[PDB]
């Protein structure tokens with residue numbers, strides 16, 4: 171029938187392997203070769219707020235999964251699904267006999283519980299996760315039979331299969347009804363008895379503590395939360411741990427073409443290292459079997475990584491980043507600086523700042539000449555390419571920048587030669603940056619010098635990640651520097667074009683708060699942004715592919731016309747690495763959060779062999 175890992179063969183307390191697998195397990199075709207059981211995968215997470223490093227190692231186990239070339243999705247946890255002709259109704263067929271990590275049957279009841287008792291429960295989630303909303307409206311989720319679940323949306327939802335393949339669309343498979351119902355008042359009529367032991371005082375917080383959510387640290391901090399993951403937490407993630415250990419799921423629901431129950435690798439061990447420089451040192455000494463998340467986006471480490479391949483016994487593979495920009499300037503339309511805000515909100519002021527920038531200098535110095543000047547738009551390889559959004563205002567034109575600033579009335583000068591506002595005060599912008607992002611910090615220093623020639627002061631406020639995010643959510647910045655997504659993943663990750671992401675749409679997080687709260691909170695966006703938000707809701711509800719294309723192209727055009735965020739360079743190659751002994755890593759996969767890379771590569775079929 172099927173075969174199993176020796177470490178499970180030796181555990182006589184488990185059911186036979188046939189009884190642990192679905193009747194028809196998902197058969198994984200390996201990337202390169204059929205594999206061998208065994209070993210520990212060594213990798214790394216940066217500190218104690220990096221739980222997505224586990225998620226992007228083991229992979230979200232969603233109803234669908236990206237293909238290796240990210241051009242479409244395929245049924246994953248679902249055996250198959252159907253779509254109604256108008257794309258309003260999705261029906262998923264599950265794999266009969268599939269089981270959770272604790273041996274409990276996996277059935278339609280779990281998906282209906284996840285959606286109706288957790289995701290769509292307004293006490294649990296006062297704002298419903300956007301992955302399941304069409305025009306701010308929720309689907310009707312119902313059990314069709316013991317292995318079939320139906321989603322009925324109030325409008326067409328063409329993108330739902332793709333959404334289900336992203337990390338943020340994985341709630342349907344995240345909650346086992348039996349275990350989680352213990353912590354839910356619709357099932358446990360004395361759930362308050364669980365509060366004290368869990369250090370909580372309400373049931374949504376109890377659910378978060380015990381059952382968790384996509385990106386909560388609690389997802390990886392307990393050994394008793396059942397899952398359908400390829401490996402399971404054994405040594406948990408915590409506030410002060412130095413390592414995390416996961417071991418194979420004995421009920422994993424996939425086999426290779428020889429009938430072997432996956433995964434091949436027995437164990438994953440994560441070093442928990444706060445200092446990014448210590449991670450670089452360990453990685454160049456070959457301490458990690460895979461590192462494809464933390465070190466590759468900053469090209470300043472690439473020379474050292476390449477140089478130490480032979481000594482460390484690893485191979486660098488270059489990935490194409492989905493991001494449009496490696497280090498974009500997010501200008502805050504709702505800056506609390508009242509004098510600056512009068513200019514920040516003018517298109518021509520933002521144009522001037524872009525024209526005063528020398529992106530060739532930025533590329534050659536901060537990015538070792540390995541990147542390329544770019545603004546915020548999708549790449550030419552994408553159907554979403556917009557020439558204006560990608561390339562306007564890219565060339566240094568200091569004279570025109572100074573001419574615009576003069577025309578805006580910023581002609582008075584202070585004793586250091588900077589421009590001032592008409593009623594005094596240096597024209598000065600505070601830029602927040604994470605201090606350990608070396609290329610981003612260096613980019614800001616070069617921009618500071620360039621803007622000085624236009625009489626504008628850039629104040630660089632570098633900090634640890636936590637203070638960077640606290641400054642952002644306090645609306646306490648004029649500029650925030652971080653990537654612009656959208657080079658390849660524009661509709662999956664539209665934060666730079668329309669203010670829909672509550673932490674990262676930093677042209678104004680108050681605008682995003684207004685969008686997500688239906689106008690009850692936050693700050694009213696300007697007319698061009700409200701129009702894009704309305705177009706975005708129409709796009710999600712588009713009845714046809716060509717209507718979707720038209721609507722999102724309109725969003726991108728308005729974004730180009732407004733020029734709200736200023737790019738420096740599109741990404742250099744992403745330098746990832748894997749040990750020479752680690753087999754079946756797809757070295758051609760793109761890099762990005764919507765595909766949870768490197769887990770896109772199906773880590774359950776990675777394996778170890780030392781081969782010539």
Ligand SMILES: O=C(O)[C@H]1O[C@H](O)[C@H](O)[C@@H](O)[C@H]1O
Pocket residue numbers: 222223226385674763
């Ligand atoms: O940690 C991760 O990989 C991810 O975390 C968040 O979801 C963030 O929005 C993503 O852009 C990515 O950084």
